[PDB]
Each structure stands twice: as C-alpha cells, then as structure tokens.
C-alpha cells in the first residue's frame, strides 16, 4: 500500500531531522563574540552609467575586474567599461523579455534567457567586428532565470520548469538533467572548483547538486517564502540565501543545517539579490526599499545604509579583486561604488 | 592618446544608435493578452492581425500597438507577471458558451465560475495596479443558438437567474428575442460586480460584446486605450 510506505518514509525523515538537530552543540554567535568590530563606511558613487531605457534585470562582471555586461527590459545588452564609462559593444536581442545575463570566464561569450524559453550564446570575438548569434539552445518548458557559465564549452541553466540541466555547445543538446524540485527554481550559484552547485526554488528549499554525481546530493529546509537570489561563499564551504520574508540566511556544506540569520524590525520588503566580498567579511544585499543594505558576515548587524537609487534594485556584484560594487536598479541607472 | 579618442568616437556612435532606438521605442503601446484555452483567444489574435510567448504588431491611424499573446509556462502567474507593469492595458478574453451542463473534467464547477475566479485574481493583484483591463465576451453566436435549442438551461445551477430581468439600458441590437438580451446582461453584470469591488479610482473595466469572427475589435481597442490614457492625463494635473 502507498500509505504504509509513506508512513515509514515520514518516520525516516523524522529520525533524519532528529539526528540533524542532535548534530549541533553550540551556535557560532558566542564564537563570533571573540572578534573585534569592523567599522562603518560611507562609500560613495564614483561613476554612473546611463545607457538603457527600461528596467535593468541582470548584470555580470568580467574576469579582468573592469569589464561588465548588463541586460535590460528594452531588449538590448551593452558592455560597459568601468573605468572610462565607454560602451564597448551593443547587441540587440530577439526577445524583449530577458531576465538573466552571463559573461564567459574567458571573455569570449555571453548568454541570455527569459520568457522565450531559449538560451542565446553569442560570439564576442569573431573575424568581423560585429557580434553575431552563435548558438540557440532549446528544450526547456520553463522561463530561464540563471545561465551561469561552467567553462568555455559548458553552460548550466536554470529554468521555470522545476528542472535544471547542464548543456553543451558543439553537440547542441543537454547532456545531464537534474530533477527533484516541486516549485520553479530561479537561483543558481557555482563553485570555485566548478564541481558542485546549489539552487533555490519557491518551495522553500535549497538543493545542492553535484555535476558529476548526476542527481541530488543535499537538501536544506529554506525560509517561509520563495527564494529570490542565492550566492556562494568564496571559501567553498558555505552559502547564503535571500527570500521575500524580509530576512536572509546562510548555511554550510559540511554540517547541513542553518548557521546564521539576518533580519531587522524596520525592514519589511523582500530581498532581491545577495553577494559577498573578496574576504567574506561583509555581506551585500538589495531590498525593495531602494537601498543596498550592507551587512556584516559575523555579527549579523547592519553597517551602513548606502542609498542612492530611486527605484527597486535588482542586481549587484563585486569584482574578482573586491575593488568596486556595480549595482543595477529599475530606473535604468547603473552605479559604480567603492 | 589616439586610442582613447577613438574609443570616445565609438561611444558617441553607440549613443547615437541608442538615441535613435529611444526615439523609435517611445511611440508604441504594449498590451497584455490574457484568456483561456477554451476561449477563442487564438481566433481573436488571428482576426486582430488583419515555445515562449508570441508577439504581434498592428497599426491603427498611424499608432503602433504591440500585442503579447501568452502561450507560456505552467499555470502559475506569480513570478512572471511582475515584468508586465508598464503595459497600456490587459485584454481579457472569456468564452460565454459554457453552460451549467458542461461543468468540467475533474477539477471544479462550470467554466464560467473558473473564468470569474481568474478575473478576480487578476483584478486583485498587487503588482497589477494602475492597469485597466478590457473585458471581452467572446463566442456569442453559440449562446444565441443554445438558448433556444433546449436541452440546457443555465438557471439550474444559477438560482439568481430567475430574479434577474433585462435592464432598461440594454440595446436591442440582436432583434430576435429578449432571452439573449437577458443572458448577455446577466453575465455582463456578474463580471462587472466581480470587477467593481476595488481600484480606488485608479483603473477601470470596459466590457464588450464581441464575436470570434468580428472585425470592429480594432476600433474598440483604439477607443478604450484613448480614454484610458486621457483619464490618467486628466488625473495627473488635478483636472479630474
């Protein structure tokens, strides 16, 4: 019978969660109390980029820590120069509804995705000066949300059909497919060694999947609401998730339960994007309250308000050397911060 | 320093191209199509012309309108509905040929109730404020054929039908029998009373009686967008 098997499964999950709760002895807050204060900073805008028309939905830095790409609701993507505020390239899209953007680690390819359920891959460096469409990837019955690059020929894409899958350029079909989420996933972060990854869904759960293993590796009980953005700690043994419940969390890979929670009484809106720094000492986040709230990775307290935008902020990201923090909002105004 | 000068020149060329794109982009209005599989939404879009979402364009009196037909993902519009916040209007299509005898396969009551619930969900959305819907009542020939064909009465599962009579504001354009005029205005008043429960004077609904093989829908959308923009302009300057 189905009922008996389901009930043994529920006792199995009950004893699993009992073991998980028994595998914890002391919180890190007491250990955190052994550290010195960090200091509050009023870092100001250095440069401002204003080229788009509609809202800005995604952005991605480069491997040189000075080039970046961003995607707008208008249907075009332009590559900025973070130093001299120059528009290196401009590419018009075929679909006007895109909500993700990526930049190749080798600085040769870009990726796009949206409600069209198609993943576009362009070729920045060609024989001709203009940029031409290289490959179109289809096969997802869901709107794309993340299109992070795994290598020069491997792309991992997140879609709204509750399934994530690894792809390939030359063959043009997905190699491996990962399933297990009930709701639609819209978050994805990679690892420094490009061997594992984590994803989040609206079902209030975070799932860690190994690329080589081929199926689910870890499952974490998330927040009380959806997951809007996720990020991976630079060390490689922890990560952080942001939700609409006006609070953020961070977990670790090895121990498999919650480590830290960030929340405040004043903040009520939902988190839109989350990022770390080079040393992982302070955590950056974006809210609907038009300000990019700066947090502390250890004390779990605020550092500075750091405002400057008029509308909802949707994306931000630090460079590979921690030199600047780009930030995109819904008013089509990029803001280089330092 | 010639490299920087050439980079600046390329930036100026890109800026000129972006200025041209902005000039082209500001003269178009975007509409959001919405409906159900049973309704002739495909028929409506096909008559309106003359794998992700579909896009179509049309020109009316030198005004360009972009219409986004929605053939899209799983039936949950909680996250992909946020991108539609600057659209001019929402065109909702409802099939008016679902009698109480055709209830459903295994899910709920008659499809009219499901359409009413869908319309209520669209109306009471949070991100969909300041947007006015253009309600449509499609598939009217079948209703007129079925009201007098027997073997199906909507009063069986709609007890409030016997208490309803045609209003004096009705227009006797069918010229056939007041039963069709009674049913038409019954369903129209039902949709209105579902609609006019909130809004606070920021958006309105415009019911219409149209057929799948109709031709004057173009003028209807033009006239409804005109008033929608005109009222907003009047309200912005404290003139309304």
């Amino acid at each position: 019978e189905l009922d008996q098997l389901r009930q043994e499964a529920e006792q199995l999950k009950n004893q699993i969660r009992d073991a998980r709760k028994a595998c914890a002895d002391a919180t890190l807050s007491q250990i955190t109390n052994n550290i010195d204060p960090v200091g509050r900073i009023q870092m100001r805008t250095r440069r401002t980029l204003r080229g788009h028309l509609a809202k800005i939905y995604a952005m991605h830095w480069g491997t040189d820590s000075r080039l970046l790409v961003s995607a707008s609701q208008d249907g075009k993507l332009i590559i900025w120069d973070s130093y001299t505020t120059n528009k290196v390239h401009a590419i018009p899209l075929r679909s006007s509804w895109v909500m993700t953007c990526a930049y190749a680690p080798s600085g040769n390819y870009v990726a796009c995705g949206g409600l069209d359920n198609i993943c576009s891959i362009y070729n920045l460096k060609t024989r001709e000066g203009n940029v031409r469409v290289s490959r179109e990837l289809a096969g997802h019955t869901g709107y794309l949300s993340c299109c992070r690059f795994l290598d020069d020929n491997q792309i991992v894409t997140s879609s709204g059909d509750t399934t994530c899958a690894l792809w390939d350029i030359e063959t043009g079909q997905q190699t491996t497919t990962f399933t297990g989420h009930t709701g639609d996933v819209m978050s994805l972060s990679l690892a420094p060694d490009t061997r594992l990854f984590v994803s989040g869904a609206c079902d209030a759960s975070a799932k860690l999947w190994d690329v080589r293993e081929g199926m689910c590796r870890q499952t974490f009980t998330g927040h009380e609401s959806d997951i809007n953005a996720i990020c991976f700690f630079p060390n490689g043994n922890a990560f952080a998730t942001g939700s609409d419940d006006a609070t953020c969390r961070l977990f670790d890979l090895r121990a498999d339960q919650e480590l830290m929670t960030y929340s405040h009484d004043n903040i009520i809106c939902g988190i839109t994007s989350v990022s770390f720094s080079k040393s992982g000492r302070l955590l950056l986040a974006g809210y609907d309250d038009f300000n990019c709230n700066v947090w502390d990775a250890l004390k779990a307290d605020r550092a500075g308000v750091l405002a400057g935008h008029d509308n909802r902020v949707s994306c931000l990201g630090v460079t590979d050397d921690g030199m600047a923090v780009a930030t995109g909002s819904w008013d089509s105004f990029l803001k280089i911060w330092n | 320093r010639n490299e920087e000068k050439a980079q600046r020149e390329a930036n100026k060329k890109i800026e000129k191209q972006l200025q041209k794109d902005k000039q082209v982009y500001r003269a178009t209005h975007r509409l959001l199509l919405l409906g159900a599989g049973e309704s002739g939404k495909n028929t409506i879009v096909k008559q309106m012309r003359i794998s992700g979402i579909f896009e179509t364009k049309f020109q009316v009196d030198k005004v360009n309108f972009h219409m986004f037909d929605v053939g899209a993902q799983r039936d949950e519009r909680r996250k992909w509905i946020q991108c539609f916040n600057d659209v001019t209007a929402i065109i909702f299509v409802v099939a008016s040929s679902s009698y109480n005898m055709v209830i459903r396969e295994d899910n709920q009551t008659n499809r009219l109730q499901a359409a009413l619930k869908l319309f209520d969900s669209i109306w009471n959305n949070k991100w969909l404020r300041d947007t006015s819907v253009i309600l449509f009542l499609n598939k009217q020939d079948l209703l007129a054929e079925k009201v007098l064909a027997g073997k199906s009465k909507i009063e069986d599962y709609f007890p409030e039908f016997a208490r309803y009579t045609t209003p004096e504001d009705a227009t006797p354009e069918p010229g056939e029998d007041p039963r069709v005029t009674r049913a038409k205005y019954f369903i129209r008043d039902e949709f209105l009373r579902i609609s006019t429960a909130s809004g606070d004077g920021r958006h309105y609904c415009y019911p219409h009686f149209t057929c799948s093989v109709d031709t004057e829908n173009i003028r209807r959308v033009f006239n409804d967008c005109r008033d929608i923009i005109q009222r907003m302009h009047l309200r912005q300057y404290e003139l309304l």
Epitope: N86, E128, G129 | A6, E9, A10
Partner: single-chain antibody
C-alpha cells in the same frame, strides 16, 4: 576577408590620379581606415587616416594639401584623390583596417597593395643585417628617442615582420600581446626606450623584414627594417 586595391601606375607630374580600395567579406562600417605608404628602398610610412564615421580626418604631416580621402559604406569603397604630384611620393600604397576599444588589436589585417611610380619621435635600428641559423636565437633591437609609456600604462609599440613578397602581417601589438594566427615562436620585451624581439625556433617562414612603430604621439612613423638571408 578580402581587400582589393585599384589605381596607380605612371603618369606625368602635375596631374590628378584616383586610388580605390574595396572591402568584401566583412562589415567595415565600424572599422577605422588607414592609407600607408612604403618607399621602394625604405620602410613603411603613414599617409592618411579616416575614422569610423568620418568624424575624424587626419592627413600626413609631410604633405597634406595634395591628398584627399573619402569613403562610401553602401558602395563599400574607400577612395583617394591626389593632385599635382611630385617625385617624392613614389611609394607602394596600402589600405589597412583597425578597430579601437579596450583589449582590441589595432592594425590586424593588411591589403595586397598597389605601386605608384613616377622633428617628431624618431626610431632607428642599429643593425641592418643579422646572419643567423635555423635553431639559434634571433634578437632584433628597437630604440626610441622618447619614452613611449603613457599615464594609462600602455606601451604603444607594434611589430610587423613582413615577408619578402606578400602583405605585411601583425605579430606583436603593444609590445606584450601576441596575435592570433602567428605561431608561438616569437616574444617581445622592453623598458620604455630600448625594446627587443626574440625568436627561439626558426623555419623557412621566418625570412622577412621587421618593423617597429609607435602610437604615443601621432606622426605614425616607422622603423628601419632588417632583411634575413639564408
């Protein structure tokens, strides 16, 4: 990528001539253009420069009143008019394309060229003929009268290594970046006023003439040139 050059020859002094360069196989509307001259017994020398959208038009410092340039994108033609010619301008003419952004490679592809026969920063090569063997190291020197470094940090220096019989190629640009189609057998280094080009392995394709050109100021002057004989 194809460049076809037409015009040139021998005409009486004082007349007017017409040169044309057509680009087929790529979109040149976003490529800056250069016309460069090479004397029969001397090295390369720049003549004229056209911006991407004709916003900037630059003429030779040695002579500019007798040169005029223009281009048409729909017809895909860059053409030159010369009036009242002298015996000085007796050099091969080349039309070259170059695009300028961050991380770009200026002066990538060169044309076949056409023959017509009738101070600023100075760079000279100490040597003129270096006899070597296929398997030893080859060193070529370059000296500049002024420090080529800029405030940004870019060392504007370019080598060509033109083969004796075909169009010049690009090997090392900005003194520290290698080209695409050049085999990994060349290297370059410098300090600001003394620069060197080093070759480890030699084959039959390394015979040619090497050039040293700078882009700090704008005389677009070139080096001397060294011929290799085996």
């Amino acid at each position: 990528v194809q460049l076809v050059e037409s015009g040139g020859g021998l005409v009486q002094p004082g007349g007017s001539r017409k040169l044309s360069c057509s680009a087929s196989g790529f979109a040149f509307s976003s490529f800056g253009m250069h016309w460069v001259r090479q004397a029969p017994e001397k090295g390369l020398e720049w003549v004229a420069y056209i911006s991407s959208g004709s916003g900037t038009i630059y003429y030779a410092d040695t002579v500019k009143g007798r040169f005029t340039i223009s281009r048409d994108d729909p017809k895909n033609t860059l053409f030159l008019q010369m009036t009242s010619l002298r015996s000085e301008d007796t050099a091969m003419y080349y039309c070259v394309r170059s695009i300028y952004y961050y991380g770009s490679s200026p002066f990538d592809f060169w044309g076949q060229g056409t023959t017509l026969t009738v101070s600023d920063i100075v760079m000279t090569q100490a040597t003129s003929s270096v006899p070597v063997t296929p398997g030893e190291s080859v060193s070529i020197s370059c000296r500049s009268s002024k420090s080529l470094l800029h405030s940004n940090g870019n060392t504007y220096l370019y080598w060509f290594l033109q083969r004796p019989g075909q169009s010049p190629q690009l090997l090392i640009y900005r003194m520290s970046n290698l080209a695409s189609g050049v085999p990994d057998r060349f290297s370059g280094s410098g300090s600001g006023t003394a620069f060197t080009l080093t070759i480890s392995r030699l084959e039959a394709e390394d015979v040619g003439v090497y050039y040293c050109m700078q882009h700090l100021e704008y005389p677009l002057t070139f080096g001397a040139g060294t011929k290799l004989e085996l």
